C-alpha cells in the first residue's frame, strides 16, 4: 504494498503539472529565452528522478505510467488537461484495474504514439520529455542488451524532436534552447548508450552537425555542451582533435551553470596537462577545482582533484596541494600522499618503490609522462631546496652529496637551472668551483609597482564584472 | 596529413585528394586552416581544374571557421559547381 | 594484381629505377583504390598492406635521397595507415620501429606536443615492446637529466641502422646548445673542456663555435666574458606608459557614468 | 547521470607532508643531535 501507489502519483503529477502547466506560461510568455522557470526546475527534478523513483522503477505492481501518458499525446482544447487528469485517475490500473505491463515491448509503438496521436501544438518539452524520460531512466537497469537500440530509438524520436525543433516553428520558438538543455543531456545519454560498447559515430559528424545547427544563429549552451562532448570523447578516443579546436576556438559569450563552466575548464585544463602548458593550467584547474564544490560524498571531487594535481606536481615545485582532508580518499589512495612525500623528499629508492609497487594504480593514473620528468622533479627539488637554502654552494657539496657522480653533471643541472632562471649561480670551471651567489634588490623599488597593474587590472576587471552584474535587473 | 601529399605535378592526384576531401571532411576541418595557401595557389592556378572545388570546400571550411565572407567570395568564384 | 613489384627487396635503391616504378606504382594505387576512406572487403585492403610496405620502402628511399617533407609525409601516410579505421590489419615487420623513426626525428625536430601525442596516440604498447621505443624515451629522460653523458653511448646501441641519421640531427641540437650553454652563461672554460664536449679536439667546428659566440679566443682558454652590460634600468619609460594606462583607466571612469 | 552506482555505497591538509617528517622521524632530533655536542 500500500505505500508504493501514493508516492509516484503525487510526485509525478507534481512534475508534469508545473512542467506542462508552467511551460505553457513559458512559451506563452512570448519572450522567454532566460526565464525557463520550470524547464531548469524540471531538469533539477530529473536529476532528482535519477536518484528517486523513475517514471516507474517497475514499482512492484505493473509499471503503468508508460502505457498511460504517451497515449493520447494531444494538447487540444483544454479538456486535454483533463485527459492528463484521466491519466491521474487511471494510475489505479496498478491498484484497481487490470494490471497491464507494456515496458520494453510496447514502448516502441508508444514512441510512435506522439506521431500516432494528433498535432503537437508547439510544446515540445512534453514530447521530447517523452523521448528521454521513458528509457533514459531505464539506463539504471544496466543490462544494455537489445535495449541499447531501444534507448537509442527513443533518441531517434528525440531526433524527430530535432526535426520538429529546428526544422519546424520558423518564428523564434525559444524552446529550442531548452531543448538544447534536454538534448545535451540525452547526448550524454548517447554517451551512456553508445559508449558502453561502441563510439558515437553518428555524433561525430552529428556532433559537428548539431554544432552546425547550433553554431551562431540560435546557439545557447550547445557550444560548450557539444564541446564538452567534443572534449570528453576525444581524450579516451585519440588526440589532435584538441588541436582541431585550436583553429576554431569558440568559448561561451556568457558562462553557463557554474558546474558546467567549472567542469569545462577542468576538461580543457586537463588537456593543457598533456599539452604541458604549466602557466595557464594551474589557474584554470585551480579555478575548476574551487568552482565545483557540490559532489557525492564518496567522491568525484577527489577524482577532479586527483587527476587535477598531477602536472601541478610536475611544475617543478608544488604547494602541499588542497586544504580539506578526506578519509575515503585516504582509503582509495588516489592522488598519492606517499608519492608527493617522495617528491618533497629528495629520495629515489622509496620513490621508485612507489613507482614500481603501485603500477596497477598507475594504470588508473594513465598519465605515465608524470614519472619521466618527475624523477627529474626529484632531482630539481633537491637542487632547488639546497640552492634555495645556501647562499653559496659548490659542486663538492651538492654534486656528490646528491651523488651526481661528477662536477659537470651538476654543472648541467645548474645549466638547466640558470636556463630555467632558478638560481643566480656561477661556476668557475678551472678548479671545480660552483662559485654560486644570490642576487640583490629584493626591495619594492620597481617590481610591486609594476605588479599593481596586474593587481589593479584584476580589480578593475572585478569592478566591471560587478557593473555588468548590476545590469541584469 | 593527406592534404600535404599534393607536391605531385599531376593534378589527378588533386582530384583523387578532393575525392578524399568530401569523403573524410567530417573530421578534418583543421588541416585546411593550415592549408589556406594551398587553396590560394590551387585556386589561382587557372588550367588546374580543381580551383572551383577549392572554392567550394574552402567555403565549407571557412564556413566552419567563421570566414563566411571569404566563403562568400569563394562562393562567387566557385562556378556552376 | 601486381604479384611482387619488390623483386629486388634487398636491392632497394642503387638507382632510381624502382623509385620511378614506385611513383608510377603508387600512382597505380591512387588510380586503383585511392586511399582508405573505403569500408573495403579486406582484399582491396591487401594492396593497402602492400601499400604500407612500399611506403615503408618509400620512406627508406626518401631518407636515401634525403627528402624530408616527402619522408615525414610518407610517414604521415603510414600514421594514416595505422590511423586507418580498420585496426584489423596484417602485421608488417617494421610496425613499431616506424614509430621509432617518427619518435626519433620527431624528437630531433623539437616538437614536444608531438612527443606527447606520440606518447598518447598509442600509449600502452610504448612501455614494454620495442627497445627502439623504450630507448629513445629513456634517452629523452637522459636529455632531461644527465645530458652530454649518454648520447654517444646510446649511439653505440642502434643495431637497426636508420637512427644514426636523425641522432646526427640530435647532434645538431647538441652543438647549438654547446653554442649557448658553455660560454655567455659562465665565467671561463679551459680549452680541454671544449676539447672533450666539442669533439675532434680542434676542427674549424669548435673554432666555428668559439668564433660563433662573437668572441675571440685566448690561448688554452675560453673566457665567457663581455656579457650583460650597462645594468639596464628603463629610466622613466614605465613611469610614462603606466600612467598612459591610467589614462584609459580614467576612460574606465568615463564609460561608467 | 551523476551517480550511476554510488548512492548504495590553515589546517592539516596543509602540513601533512612536512608533518610526516614530524610523524615518523626526528622525535628527539636536537635532543640526540643536540646531544652530539657533549656525547661526542
UniProtKB/Swiss-Prot annotation, chain A:
Tell me where the cross-link Glycyl lysine isopeptide (Lys-Gly) (interchain with G-Cter in SUMO1) is found. Answer: 14
- GO molecular-function term, one example from the UniProt record: enzyme regulator activity
Task: Recite the UniProt keywords alphabetically.
Answer: Isopeptide bond, Phosphoprotein, Proteasome, Ubl conjugation
Q: Which residues carry this modification: Phosphoserine?
A: 394, 406
Name the GO terms of the biological process aspect: proteasome-mediated ubiquitin-dependent protein catabolic process; regulation of protein catabolic process; ubiquitin-dependent protein catabolic process
Q: Where is this cross-link: Glycyl lysine isopeptide (Lys-Gly) (interchain with G-Cter in SUMO2)?
A: 14
A cellular component term, taken from the record's GO annotations: extracellular exosome
Q: Which residues form the PCI domain?
A: 262-441
Query: InterPro entries given for it?
Result: 26S_Psome_reg_C (IPR013586), CSN3 (IPR050756), PCI_dom (IPR000717), TPR-like_helical_dom_sf (IPR011990), WH_DNA-bd_sf (IPR036390)
SUPFAM superfamilies for this protein: Winged helix' DNA-binding domain
Q: Where is this region: Disordered?
A: 1-45
Q: How does it assemble?
A: Component of the 19S proteasome regulatory particle complex. The 26S proteasome consists of a 20S core particle (CP) and two 19S regulatory subunits (RP). The regulatory particle is made of a lid composed of 9 subunits including PSMD3, a base containing 6 ATPases and few additional components. Interacts with UBQLN1 (via ubiquitin-like domain). Interacts with ERCC6.
Family statement drawn from the similarity comment of this UniProt entry: Belongs to the proteasome subunit S3 family.
Q: What is this protein called?
A: 26S proteasome non-ATPase regulatory subunit 3
- Taxonomic lineage from the root: Eukaryota, Metazoa, Chordata, Craniata, Vertebrata
Swiss-Prot record, chain B:
Q: Which domain of life is it from?
A: Eukaryota
Q: Which cysteines are joined by disulfide bonds?
A: none
The UniProt similarity line reads: Belongs to the proteasome subunit S1 family.
Question: What the protein does?
Answer: Component of the 26S proteasome, a multiprotein complex involved in the ATP-dependent degradation of ubiquitinated proteins. This complex plays a key role in the maintenance of protein homeostasis by removing misfolded or damaged proteins, which could impair cellular functions, and by removing proteins whose functions are no longer required. Therefore, the proteasome participates in numerous cellular processes, including cell cycle progression, apoptosis, or DNA damage repair.
Q: How does it assemble?
A: Component of the 19S proteasome regulatory particle complex. The 26S proteasome consists of a 20S core particle (CP) and two 19S regulatory subunits (RP). The regulatory particle is made of a lid composed of 9 subunits, a base containing 6 ATPases and few additional components including PSMD1. Interacts with ADRM1. Interacts with ZFAND1.
Name assigned to this protein: 26S proteasome non-ATPase regulatory subunit 1
Organism, by scientific name, is Homo sapiens
UniProtKB/Swiss-Prot annotation, chain C:
* Lineage of the organism: Eukaryota, Metazoa, Chordata, Craniata, Vertebrata
Q: Where is this cross-link: Glycyl lysine isopeptide (Lys-Gly) (interchain with G-Cter in SUMO2)?
A: 204
Which family, according to the similarity comment? Belongs to the proteasome subunit S14 family.
Per the record, the GO terms for biological process are: proteasome-mediated ubiquitin-dependent protein catabolic process
Shown part of the complete sequence: 94 to 350 of 350
Keyword rRNA-binding carried by entry: no
Q: Which residues carry this modification: Phosphoserine?
A: 13
A GO CC annotation given for this chain: proteasome regulatory particle, lid subcomplex
Task: Tell me the gene name.
Answer: PSMD8
Domain of life from the UniProt record? Eukaryota
Keywords from UniProt, A to Z, are: Isopeptide bond, Phosphoprotein, Proteasome, Ubl conjugation
Its job: Component of the 26S proteasome, a multiprotein complex involved in the ATP-dependent degradation of ubiquitinated proteins. This complex plays a key role in the maintenance of protein homeostasis by removing misfolded or damaged proteins, which could impair cellular functions, and by removing proteins whose functions are no longer required. Therefore, the proteasome participates in numerous cellular processes, including cell cycle progression, apoptosis, or DNA damage repair.
**Disulfide-bonded cysteines:** none
Q: How does it assemble?
A: Component of the 19S proteasome regulatory particle complex. The 26S proteasome consists of a 20S core particle (CP) and two 19S regulatory subunits (RP). The regulatory particle is made of a lid composed of 9 subunits including PSMD8, a base containing 6 ATPases and few additional components. Interacts with DDI2. Interacts with TASOR.
Name its species. Homo sapiens
Q: Give residue ranges for domain PCI.
A: 69-238
Q: What name has this protein been given in UniProt?
A: 26S proteasome non-ATPase regulatory subunit 8
From Swiss-Prot, chain D:
Instruction: Name the keywords, alphabetized.
Output: Nucleus, Proteasome
Its localization reads: Nucleus
Listed transmembrane segments: none
Expression sites by tissue: Expressed in limb bud, craniofacial primordia and skin.
The Gene Ontology CC terms held by the record are: cytosol; integrator complex; nucleoplasm; proteasome complex; proteasome regulatory particle, lid subcomplex; protein-containing complex
Signal peptide stretch: none
GO terms under biological process: double-strand break repair via homologous recombination; mRNA export from nucleus; proteasome assembly; proteasome-mediated ubiquitin-dependent protein catabolic process
| Primary location class | nucleus
**Mind telling me which Pfam families this protein's record contains?**
DSS1_SEM1 (PF05160)
> Cross-referenced InterPro entries, in alphabetical order?
DSS1_SEM1 (IPR007834)
Q: What is the protein's known function? A: Component of the 26S proteasome, a multiprotein complex involved in the ATP-dependent degradation of ubiquitinated proteins. This complex plays a key role in the maintenance of protein homeostasis by removing misfolded or damaged proteins, which could impair cellular functions, and by removing proteins whose functions are no longer required. Therefore, the proteasome participates in numerous cellular processes, including cell cycle progression, apoptosis, or DNA damage repair.
* Family statement drawn from the similarity comment of this UniProt entry: Belongs to the DSS1/SEM1 family.
The name under which this protein is listed is 26S proteasome complex subunit SEM1
Amino acid at each position: 504494498e500500500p505505500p508504493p501507489p501514493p508516492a509516484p502519483q503525487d510526485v509525478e503529477m507534481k512534475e508534469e503539472a508545473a512542467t506542462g502547466g508552467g511551460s505553457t506560461g513559458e512559451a506563452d510568455g512570448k519572450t522567454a529565452a532566460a526565464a525557463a522557470e520550470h524547464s531548469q526546475r524540471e531538469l533539477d527534478t530529473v536529476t532528482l528522478e535519477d536518484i528517486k523513483e523513475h517514471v516507474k522503477q517497475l514499482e512492484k505492481a505493473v509499471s503503468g505510467k508508460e502505457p498511460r501518458f504517451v497515449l493520447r499525446a494531444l494538447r487540444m482544447l483544454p479538456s486535454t488537461s483533463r485527459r492528463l487528469n484521466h491519466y491521474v485517475l487511471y494510475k489505479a490500473v496498478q491498484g484497481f484495474f487490470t494490471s497491464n505491463n507494456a515496458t520494453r515491448d510496447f514502448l516502441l509503438p508508444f514512441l510512435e504514439e506522439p506521431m500516432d496521436t494528433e498535432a503537437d501544438l508547439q510544446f515540445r518539452p512534453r514530447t521530447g520529455k517523452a523521448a528521454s524520460t521513458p528509457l533514459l531512466p531505464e539506463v539504471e537497469a544496466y543490462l544494455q542488451l537489445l535495449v541499447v537500440i531501444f534507448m537509442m530509438n527513443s533518441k531517434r524520436y528525440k531526433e524527430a524532436q530535432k526535426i520538429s525543433d529546428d526544422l519546424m516553428q520558423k518564428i523564434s520558438t525559444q524552446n529550442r534552447r531548452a531543448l538544447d538543455l534536454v538534448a545535451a543531456k540525452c547526448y550524454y545519454y548517447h554517451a551512456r548508450v553508445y559508449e558502453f560498447l561502441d563510439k558515437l559515430d553518428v555524433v561525430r559528424s552529428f556532433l559537428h552537425a548539431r554544432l552546425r545547427t547550433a553554431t551562431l544563429r540560435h546557439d545557447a549552451d550547445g557550444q560548450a555542451t557539444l564541446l564538452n562532448l567534443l572534449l570528453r570523447n576525444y581524450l579516451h578516443y585519440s588526440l589532435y582533435d584538441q588541436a582541431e579546436k585550436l583553429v576554431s576556438k569558440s568559448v561561451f559569450p556568457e558562462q553557463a551553470n557554474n558546474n558546467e563552466w567549472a567542469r569545462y575548464l577542468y576538461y580543457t585544463g586537463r588537456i593543457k596537462a598533456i599539452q604541458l602548458e604549466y602557466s595557464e593550467a594551474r589557474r584554470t584547474m585551480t579555478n575548476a577545482l574551487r568552482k565545483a564544490p557540490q559532489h557525492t560524498a564518496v567522491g568525484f571531487k577527489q577524482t577532479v582533484h586527483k587527476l587535477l594535481i598531477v602536472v601541478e606536481l610536475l611544475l617543478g615545485e608544488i604547494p602541499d596541494r588542497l586544504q580539506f582532508r578526506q578519509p575515503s580518499l585516504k582509503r582509495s589512495l588516489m592522488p598519492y600522499f606517499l608519492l608527493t612525500q617522495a617528491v618533497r623528499t629528495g629520495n629515489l629508492a622509496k620513490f621508485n618503490q612507489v613507482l614500481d609497487q603501485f603500477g596497477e594504480k598507475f594504470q588508473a593514473d594513465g598519465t605515465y609522462t608524470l614519472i619521466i620528468r618527475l624523477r627529474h622533479n626529484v632531482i630539481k627539488t633537491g637542487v632547488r631546496m639546497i640552492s634555495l637554502s645556501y647562499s653559496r654552494i659548490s659542486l663538492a657539496d651538492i654534486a656528490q652529496k646528491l651523488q651526481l657522480d661528477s662536477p659537470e653533471d651538476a654543472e648541467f643541472i645548474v645549466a638547466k637551472a640558470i636556463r630555467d632562471g632558478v638560481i643566480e649561480a656561477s661556476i668557475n670551471h678551472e678548479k671545480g668551483y660552483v662559485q654560486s651567489k644570490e642576487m640583490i634588490d629584493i626591495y619594492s623599488t620597481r617590481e610591486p609597482q609594476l605588479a599593481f597593474h596586474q593587481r589593479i587590472s584584476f580589480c578593475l576587471d572585478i569592478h566591471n564584472m560587478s557593473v555588468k552584474a548590476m545590469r541584469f535587473p | 596529413g593527406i592534404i600535404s601529399l599534393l607536391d605531385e605535378d599531376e593534378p589527378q592526384l588533386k582530384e583523387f585528394a578532393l575525392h578524399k576531401l568530401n569523403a573524410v571532411v567530417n573530421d578534418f576541418w583543421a588541416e585546411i586552416s593550415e592549408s589556406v595557401d594551398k587553396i590560394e595557389v590551387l585556386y589561382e592556378d587557372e588550367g588546374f581544374r580543381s580551383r572551383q572545388f577549392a572554392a567550394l570546400v574552402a567555403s565549407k571550411v571557412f564556413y566552419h571557421l567563421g570566414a563566411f565572407e571569404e566563403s562568400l567570395n569563394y562562393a562567387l568564384g566557385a562556378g556552376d559547381l | 594484381m601486381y604479384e611482387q613489384l619488390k623483386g629486388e627487396w634487398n636491392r632497394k635503391s642503387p638507382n632510381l629505377s624502382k623509385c620511378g616504378e614506385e611513383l608510377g606504382r603508387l600512382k597505380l594505387v591512387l588510380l586503383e583504390l585511392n586511399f582508405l576512406p573505403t569500408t573495403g572487403t579486406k582484399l582491396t585492403k591487401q594492396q593497402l598492406i602492400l601499400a604500407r610496405d612500399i611506403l615503408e620502402i618509400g620512406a627508406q628511399w626518401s631518407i636515401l635521397r634525403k627528402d624530408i617533407p616527402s619522408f615525414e609525409r610518407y610517414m604521415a601516410q603510414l600514421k594514416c595507415y595505422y590511423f586507418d579505421y580498420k585496426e584489423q590489419l596484417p602485421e608488417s615487420a617494421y610496425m613499431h620501429q616506424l614509430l621509432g623513426l617518427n619518435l626519433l626525428f620527431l624528437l630531433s625536430q623539437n616538437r614536444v606536443a608531438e612527443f606527447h601525442t606520440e606518447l598518447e596516440r598509442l600509449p600502452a604498447k610504448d612501455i614494454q615492446t620495442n627497445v627502439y621505443i623504450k630507448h629513445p624515451v629513456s634517452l629523452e629522460q637522459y636529455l632531461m637529466e644527465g645530458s652530454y653523458n649518454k648520447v654517444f653511448l646510446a649511439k653505440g646501441n642502434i643495431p637497426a641502422e636508420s637512427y644514426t641519421f636523425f641522432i646526427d640531427i640530435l647532434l645538431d641540437t647538441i652543438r647549438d646548445e654547446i653554442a649557448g650553454c658553455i660560454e655567455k652563461a659562465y665565467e671561463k672554460i679551459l680549452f680541454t673542456e671544449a676539447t672533450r664536449i666539442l669533439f675532434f679536439n680542434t676542427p674549424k667546428k669548435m673554432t666555428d663555435y668559439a668564433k660563433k659566440r662573437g668572441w675571440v679566443l685566448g690561448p688554452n682558454n675560453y673566457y665567457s666574458f663581455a656579457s650583460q652590460q650597462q645594468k639596464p634600468e628603463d629610466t622613466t619609460i614605465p613611469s610614462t606608459e603606466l600612467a598612459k594606462q591610467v589614462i584609459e583607466y580614467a576612460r574606465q571612469l568615463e564609460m561608467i557614468v | 547521470m551523476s551517480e550511476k552506482k554510488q548512492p548504495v555505497d590553515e589546517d592539516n591538509w596543509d602540513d601533512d607532508n612536512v608533518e610526516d617528517d614530524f610523524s615518523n622521524q626526528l622525535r628527539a632530533e636536537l635532543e640526540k643531535h643536540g646531544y652530539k655536542m657533549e656525547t661526542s
